[PDB]
Amino acid sequence: EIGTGFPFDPHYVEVLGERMHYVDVGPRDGTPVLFLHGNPTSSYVWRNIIPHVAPTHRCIAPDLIGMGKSDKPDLGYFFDDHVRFMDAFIEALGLEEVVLVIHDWGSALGFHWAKRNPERVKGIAFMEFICPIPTWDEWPMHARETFQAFRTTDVGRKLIIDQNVFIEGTLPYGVVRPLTEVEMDHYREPFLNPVDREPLWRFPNELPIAGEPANIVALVEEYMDWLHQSPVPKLLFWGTPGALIPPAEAARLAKSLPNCKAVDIGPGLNLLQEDNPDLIGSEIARWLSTLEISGH
């Protein structure tokens, strides 16, 4: 009873001269809800969540540049490249105020956008998000060893670029329930050609771990300090054991962040959307019905 289909018409918009693919469903009668995926997923990750929200709120879910059905410009696919394209995507759709629903690298994009444009963010739903990781000791050995290997230019590229391990390993390892072959083939579609795998390797190399890279550590601290002082409505989803956000950290954030509701999805690792999309979609729709936005 977790759906494998993608029941949305294709949309594409030109952004900095490149095409970006996106979902866009639901009425243009209020504040749209912008869904931002991370590594190594696409808008496909939101397929079972959006249908709970779309009847009453417009849902917009882009594929990041170099990912999903978006174009593949010859870039390094550093976080700042994703910032440029996601800022331009939001402007190309003429979005004014938004609600954010964000995950993994999509959460870095959304929180960084919110810090720069705080008056335009009416709420943030977030899960398995990017915050500073001051020590490798915070991760279990198996995850520590694999990401330390990923964060090399020789070994890391052989694994992610040549062997496609982020798709063939990290992805199904991040879902507690078994991902099916149909779902794996959806996630594999953008990365059939090894030369298209650059974003999958640059992303782990950008993760703010033990002080490096220092520019990402600084920007992440900046948007976490922003979040910690912001009155914006917040909805945090978490699972057990989690990956980036263990239960103990979710419990801390539930008390430290202003105007925050936390929801336990049950068993989960990084890809919570693949373990309990029904609860995540149901709870986003209930929370949207409490915000001071059109339709309240």
Ligand SMILES: [Cl-]
């Ligand atoms: Cl990553």
